[PDB]
Amino acid sequence: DWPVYHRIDGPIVMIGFGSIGRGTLPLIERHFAFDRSKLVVIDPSDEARKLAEARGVRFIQQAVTRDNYRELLVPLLTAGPGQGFCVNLSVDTSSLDIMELARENGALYIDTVVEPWLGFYFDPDLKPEARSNYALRETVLAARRNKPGGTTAVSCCGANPGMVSWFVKQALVNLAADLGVTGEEPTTREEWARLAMDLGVKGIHIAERDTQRASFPKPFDVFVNTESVEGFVSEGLQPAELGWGTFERWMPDNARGHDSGCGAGIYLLQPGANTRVRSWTPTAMAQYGFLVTHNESISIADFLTVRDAAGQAVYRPTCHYAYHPCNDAVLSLHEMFGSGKRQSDWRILDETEIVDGIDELGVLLYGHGKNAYWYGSQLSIEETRRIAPDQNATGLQVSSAVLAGMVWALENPNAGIVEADDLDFRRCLEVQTPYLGPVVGVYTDWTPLAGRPGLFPEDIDTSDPWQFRNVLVR
Amino acid sequence: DWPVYHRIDGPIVMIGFGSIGRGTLPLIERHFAFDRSKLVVIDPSDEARKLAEARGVRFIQQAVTRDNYRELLVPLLTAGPGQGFCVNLSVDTSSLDIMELARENGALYIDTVVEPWLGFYFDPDLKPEARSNYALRETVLAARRNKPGGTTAVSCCGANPGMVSWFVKQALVNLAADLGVTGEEPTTREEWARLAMDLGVKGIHIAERDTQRASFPKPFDVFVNTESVEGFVSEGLQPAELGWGTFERWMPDNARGHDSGCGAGIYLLQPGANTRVRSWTPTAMAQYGFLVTHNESISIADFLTVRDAAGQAVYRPTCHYAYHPCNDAVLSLHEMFGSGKRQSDWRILDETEIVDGIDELGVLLYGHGKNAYWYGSQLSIEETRRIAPDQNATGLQVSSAVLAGMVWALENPNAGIVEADDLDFRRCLEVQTPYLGPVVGVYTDWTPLAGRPGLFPEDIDTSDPWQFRNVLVR
Ligand SMILES: NC(=O)c1ccc[n+]([C@@H]2O[C@H](COP(=O)([O-])OP(=O)(O)OC[C@H]3O[C@@H](n4cnc5c(N)ncnc54)[C@H](O)[C@@H]3O)[C@@H](O)[C@H]2O)c1
Ligand SMILES: NC(=O)c1ccc[n+]([C@@H]2O[C@H](COP(=O)([O-])OP(=O)(O)OC[C@H]3O[C@@H](n4cnc5c(N)ncnc54)[C@H](O)[C@@H]3O)[C@@H](O)[C@H]2O)c1
């Protein structure tokens, strides 16, 4: 039977019941003990209501807004008897305002993204710098400094951001042994950054390849994806964004830094979902990825930053997304940007519609003695159906990572505001690994200069294959 | 009751039996009168032989090379009793050499491309400018100057290059009439160029959208297309090319002109199949197109050039391909360029495999008073199966254009070396129209500046939306 990790003796408030909420709720009932009536789901859509009613769970058909979130949520969070848990899996809501609301009411909190109130993503008056995830992330870092410690609030604990942070630590451990780097396993942020520096890790790709396919072809004028379309399109239209490593010798003309913050990121003045990079995964081998902005791009580079006594950074890795979505999403991207506007409709591929395919999601560490090393999951839809209901392979990697964040938080309920990089990676993977299918590490001799230059003059840097000048596609 | 247009009183030698050869052979048998034993096919492929054997057609399994084409084609084309016809529908053969050989022995000739001998396209010792279709077309133009007149030989008479030259003439006449400009239509090149100048036609997209899809999904590591894969990938890896209009005020930094020749073209130092442009078709609306180099991009711009007394160009339209192939081909291109290498296998979708779709292929005249006007064919696969065998919608548009060009050559056998721009377009479209499905003209108020600028800074020219500055994706 499945392990029941803890009893939750308080209200469980799930904000948003979309593709990820539908997959997470079954996992919460499976691995936690509690009275079913103590759970409550909040979502404005009629489709979510009918699903919630099919589960016999309390439902409030309401959109959480800046105007109503205090009056709406505080009664739900303080209903008792004990400590409540706010599980935020929504769009169009401010992760920071809800997070702060839960903390000051003594309720645990978890989400999978730093989401802003509706209007932010397309606000015409915001500068590209303020539209970046770097800026959104700095609002959570500022909150953590203004109110250190307290009730635990786990920020950005999905598959990516989230799971991949744990994969980076396990990958670093594996690389140390394989490169025969002597030493004791790191137990602090400073020790981890120092290990990556000592291993010669110049950068990291969040290298992903989704091969799931449906029984019907991509409909015309319909955006298709295996997870949130609204969320993917929104982040796809934000600036391309990456953690900027100290080994880089070149950035493009339309790249910009930040005047304040942790200083670990840059951004390009162009949408990320229409920005290609050269990357690599085990199933796909050499492929194009899209440089979509993610929280872990900034948080991983910042976490693995080494500073001198003066506070200046002397080592940090490059880190960014390299996303090859399912073929219907690639076509949807080609369609959307080719038209200049969102499609008239969208849909998320369901477990009942997907014929085959996997979601290969891992971290690719490069620049070290063995060139490149990819570590991550290869979960298949066949395995997904066999172990978890109401979700495809993309959704299970995410929902299982929310399960591990919830377990860690109940076991560490007074750790303050934390990101996935602050969680005990070994305990989190122990919870999640049953839902990840094969988890493997693989070396490769491939580099972004393979087969280059070709028959056209090209702006490459042959001294160092992994320079961003060689990765970025023009 | 199919019309039989002409008797062919000599040998019919068809070089190549791929997708286009298979679709063209039934049309030759259908529309021309000749003794069955006069037609012979030459193709080195084993798959081709078995097909031809099943049609009861003579087949010589041999590659036409530089070291054998004289001793092979001369006897075959001069077998008598009178004039033969060389139908060249192959890859890796020299169109020019075979064409000059046919003319030297009084045989008519037609092809759909200026193809070089094997080894030319990927030769590392060639500058990009030498690998341009502009350079190839100049060899044909020079051959015409060195031997004016003589036996007719039709260069590049397929769907595009070929049929789209006739669409431009019809579109120009339609635009005039829609403006209330009656009167005698042009009958010389000078008058045609003047008409385009007088109507304010700033440029022309060969605007195409293929919607044919297969009963199976895109297989991994396979390049899929509705026509020649080897032919498509070769031109896709050639530099991007376009006829360069006199109204253009900007070109990229990696754009180059030519020192010699007609002087109508530029090229970019990047592969066309990885270069995107903003265009439009009736069924697709606003879409991305690929800037694949094509012969008609130059010949149309050249044909519609107006010069002053000194010989300098005072008007010329911009002209280039804006190709949106089928979805599997879009995926194939993403896969080929993302990995940096041709796939291990390829296949051309057969009519038995295609489940639905059309080949929407026409010309988009822009810059005039009515903004933009699309004229062309919307042939569907369903109508294709009802009227012609052994081909899909893409192939039928090509084979029927070859049919049209053969009719014109047989009717005008002493015209010398000619391009599709030099043919009687009303007679050619009279022959081809039964195989083009809906042939319609559509006006649109769309421009490349639709919805721009976005949330990012952009280098655009708001005074003239159709400037290549705004069309080219950057
Ligand atoms: N880190 C990761 O790995 C990861 C992976 C997938 C999704 N996500 C994120 O998780 C979130 C949920 O993803 P999903 O696939 O379920 O998205 P989805 O679009 O399928 O679901 C969104 C749900 O939120 C609801 N909603 C919209 N506005 C709301 C409001 N104002 N208040 C309350 N609810 C509202 C909708 O009714 C819908 O049911 C997204 O924001 C996405 O960015 C993260
Ligand atoms: N203008 C147009 O509208 C248009 C459209 C499609 C294709 N084309 C052109 O038509 C040509 C044929 O197209 P397809 O779809 O039939 O291509 P295909 O790849 O389906 O067929 C090519 C054939 O040429 C044969 N071949 C290869 N080397 C040869 C040699 N040395 N001698 C004789 N035969 C040889 C192959 O065996 C093959 O059967 C291509 O060159 C392509 O560029 C033009």
Author numbering:
A (entry chain A), B (entry chain B): 3 to 476
Paper text:
Bacterial HSS is mostly found in α-proteobacteria and in some β- and γ-proteobacteria, including pathogenic strains such as Legionella pneumophila, Brucella spp. and various P. aeruginosa strains, including PA7 and PA14. It catalyzes the conversion of two molecules of putrescine (PUT; 1,4-diaminobutane) into one molecule of sym-homospermidine [HSP; bis(4-aminobutyl)amine] as the main reaction along with several side reactions. Bacterial HSS is NAD+-dependent, active at neutral to basic pH with an optimum at pH ∼8.8, and shows increased activity in the presence of 50 mM potassium ion. BvHSS forms a dimer, with each subunit containing a boot-shaped substrate-binding pocket between an NAD(P)-binding Rossmann-like domain and an HSS-like domain. The cofactor NAD+ is bound as a prosthetic group in the binding pocket with its nicotinamide ring being part of the active site.
The W229E variant was generated to scrutinize the possible stabilization of positively charged reaction components by a salt bridge instead of a cation–π interaction. The only exception was the structure of the BvHSS variant W229E, which could only be refined to a maximum resolution of 2.76 Å. Apart from the exchanged residues, all residues in the binding pockets of these variants superimpose almost perfectly onto the wild-type residues without considerable deviations. Regarding the structure of the inactive variant W229E, the location of the carboxyl group of Glu229 is probably not completely fixed. The carboxyl group is rotated between the two subunits of the variant and the omit maps reveal a lack of electron density clearly supporting the location of the carboxyl group. A reduced occupancy of the carboxyl group at a defined location due to flexibility of the side chain or radiation damage affecting the carboxyl group should therefore be assumed. In any case, the side chain of Glu229 is able to protrude into the active site, as modeled in the variant structure, which would sterically interfere with substrate binding. In conclusion, the inactivity of both variants W229E and W229K is not necessarily caused by their inability to provide cation–π interaction but might rather result from steric issues or an enlarged space enabling increased flexibility of the substrate. Still, both variants are inactive as expected for a cation–π-dependent reaction mechanism.
